[PDB]
């Protein structure tokens, strides 16, 4: 079996990307922000609390004659950025772009942090990185992508995410006319539960190509590209008036700049970030001050190849008995 669904901005500087998942019967749609730095498929639900729910479809259980709690599961989670959300589980029937999973750990959120509430736009998560982060609790649950993968035609999915622009999310096969040359697979550590991997190196602009190694995780569900302070500090001095800002919280730059592009290696392979897409606009309505879609992760303990450098490439999640991730430019 193959699965394929297209996966749209949430806004105008690509926060997050959102893609329609059918969850029970009847089908109940709810757009979820894809996540492979994480592995909980959860939901806002009618069982979230009211006040707690701003604008997001919700999924009610009572309402899909497949759905089944799933006795005595509990799940709470945290993300990187602070936010977090926890409840119970049922199990259901998922459906994602035409690939069907019986019995899917479904986590309904009985409470949501404010970053949620707030986001009218996402209505939860479907995490694709390893199993072994699932949260559930007292039996830990696989992700969507871990059932499907027996039945699928090769154990994969795809990430092909647009630059101010839909995508596409794949599960099954690799689309060989959604990229340019040759992919470039590299390896994988599943010790963390991410899919981590090392870059071979980076150039900012026109300059040259500097080979060091530089391990982090290929994660969709963060928005901007985090690496050394080292790295992030030769980015942006080769931008006029680019400064490291404590009171907004990363680097920033005048939005009359023109951003330079930023390479980074795969093997022997280059991946070209183009300037604009890291540029995320105004601080603040109004503003002069950008803010930049590298920042450091120096305090973050980990280098996050989020969608900044993702969307640069088509990426191939690779879930053989021995995972590796593949780049290919596009």
């Known amino acids: 079996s193959t699965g394929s669904a297209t996966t ?54 009572s309402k899909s004659t497949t759905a089944k709690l799933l ?16 409840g119970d589980v049922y199990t259901d029937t998922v459906s994602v772009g035409g690939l069907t999973v019986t019995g899917q750990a479904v986590e309904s959120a009985k409470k949501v942090s404010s970053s949620f509430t707030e986001d009218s736009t996402i209505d939860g998560l479907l995490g694709l990185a390893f199993s072994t982060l699932n949260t559930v609790s007292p039996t830990q649950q696989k992700t969507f992508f871990d059932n499907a993968k027996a039945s699928l035609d090769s154990p994969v999915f795809t990430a092909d995410l647009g630059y101010h622009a839909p995508g596409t999310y794949n599960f099954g096969f690799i689309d060989t006319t959604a990229y340019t040359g040759s992919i470039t ?35 969709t569900g963060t928005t901007l590209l985090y690496l050394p302070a080292t790295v992030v500090s030769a980015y942006w001095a080769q931008v ?47 503003s002069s001050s950008c803010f930049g879609g590298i920042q450091s992760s120096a305090g973050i303990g980990i280098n996050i190849f989020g969608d900044v450098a993702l969307k640069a490439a088509f990426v191939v999640f690779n879930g053989a008995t021995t995972p590796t991730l593949g780049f290919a430019s596009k």
């Open 240 to 286: 006029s008036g680019a400064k490291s800002s404590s009171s907004v919280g990363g680097y920033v730059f005048p939005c009359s700049a023109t951003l330079p592009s930023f390479t980074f290696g795969v093997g022997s392979a280059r991946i070209v970030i183009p300037g604009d897409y890291i540029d995320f606009g105004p601080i603040s309505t109004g």
């Open 8 to 61: 749209t901005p949430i806004d105008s500087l690509d926060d997050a990307y959102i893609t329609p998942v059918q969850i029970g019967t009847p089908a109940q749609t709810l757009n979820l922000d894809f996540d492979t730095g994480s592995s909980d498929l959860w939901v806002f639900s009618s069982e979230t609390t009211a006040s707690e729910v701003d604008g997001q479809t919700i999924y009610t259980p």
């Open 185 to 219: 697979y590299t390896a994988v550590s599943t010790k963390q539960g991410f899919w981590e991997w090392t870059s071979t190196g980076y150039a900012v602009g026109s300059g040259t190509f500097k080979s060091t190694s530089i391990d982090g995780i290929a994660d």
């Open 71 to 86: 006795s005595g599961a509990t799940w709470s989670i945290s993300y990187g950025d602070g936010s977090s959300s926890s």
